[PDB]
């Protein structure tokens, strides 16, 4: 057992979703509470830490550390920190200063200083399963969901302008820009911002999912069958693997156009080797395995009584 942990989350009212579902995991072998800043009034009690990004915490992060010297501090990289920690003096504190470090894909550890890795762990992230679904051969249906890379994904749909074979469906909230695309390409729709239930059922029910960001939605495709079109960045690498098919270069929408033209051709194939090479990735993403890699994150950053 029973230490009692705190989960530093400073979103402003991704990382809360992830502290949350951290809480969750965690509260059948801690007392877990989540808050936005360390100090609060209940913190005499606390031995264990894990705080999310390591400048947008680097406050309670340092405040921790005065507190517990070398003791329960586990620093959360979760993206734009990682790669922040280049000039941010605050980053490169927290990572200074933490027990252990956390990144969220394989890949992590290498953006990390080289004094920093031996203290890093690979916790990978994780969400609950949906069925496969039966698909159909006679098109190919592509879902990106990304608030609003949007231009990559534009060229590639004004490069496949005809096709109503191929067919883009970007969800999320903005935009003009996309309302065009979407009058003047058949097959490009912005179904914009949609509910979350209704986001997944899209990502099940979709052919191929489109991530040209430079993760959470990559795991939602993974886990529901669903193969992933995504640029060759090294989040996304971590997620899908070094020898993954479905790469395209960062910023290169012919590549990406390219690539789901490749997709569709394989109908009646490169789809599926995808649908094969996503399922082995899907039990990373096992809600069993994030708790468990917690469970010993826990054991390592608890401290002996004072
Ligand atoms: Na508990």
Redesign the pocket.
């Known amino acids: 057992s029973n230490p009692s942990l705190v989960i530093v989350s400073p979103a402003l009212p991704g990382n809360w979703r992830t502290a949350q579902r951290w809480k969750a995991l965690l509260?059948?072998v801690?007392?877990?509470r989540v808050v936005q800043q360390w100090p609060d009034a209940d913190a005499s009690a606390d031995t264990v830490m894990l705080a999310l990004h390591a400048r947008r915490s680097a406050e309670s992060i340092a405040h921790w550390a005065h507190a517990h010297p070398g003791r329960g501090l586990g620093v959360v990289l979760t993206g734009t920190d990682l790669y922040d920690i280049g000039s941010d003096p605050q980053a490169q504190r927290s990572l200074q200063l933490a027990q252990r470090l956390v990144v969220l894909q394989a890949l992590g550890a290498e953006a990390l200083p080289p004094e920093c890795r031996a203290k890093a762990r690979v916790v990978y992230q994780s969400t609950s399963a949906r069925a496969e679904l039966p698909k159909s051969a006679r098109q190919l249906r592509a879902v990106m969901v990304g608030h609003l890379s949007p231009q990559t994904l534009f060229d590639a749909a004004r490069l496949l302008c005809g096709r109503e074979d191929i067919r883009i469906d970007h969800i999320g909230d903005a935009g003009e820009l996309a309302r065009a695309l979407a009058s003047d390409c058949p097959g490009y729709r912005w179904l914009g911002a949609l509910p979350h239930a209704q986001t997944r059922q899209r990502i099940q029910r979709a052919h191929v999912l489109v991530h040209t960001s430079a993760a959470h939605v990559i795991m939602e495709a993974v886990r529901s069958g669903t193969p992933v079109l995504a640029s060759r960045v090294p989040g996304n690498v971590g997620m899908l693997g070094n020898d993954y098919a479905g790469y395209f270069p960062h910023g290169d929408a012919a590549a990406l156009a390219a690539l789901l033209e490749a997709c569709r051709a394989g109908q009646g194939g490169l789809l599926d080797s995808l649908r094969t090479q996503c399922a082995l990735r899907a039990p990373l993403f096992d809600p069993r395995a994030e708790q468990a890699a917690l469970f010993q994150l826990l054991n390592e950053l608890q401290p002996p009584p004072p």
Do not use: F, Q, V
């Open positions: 509260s059948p801690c007392s877990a």
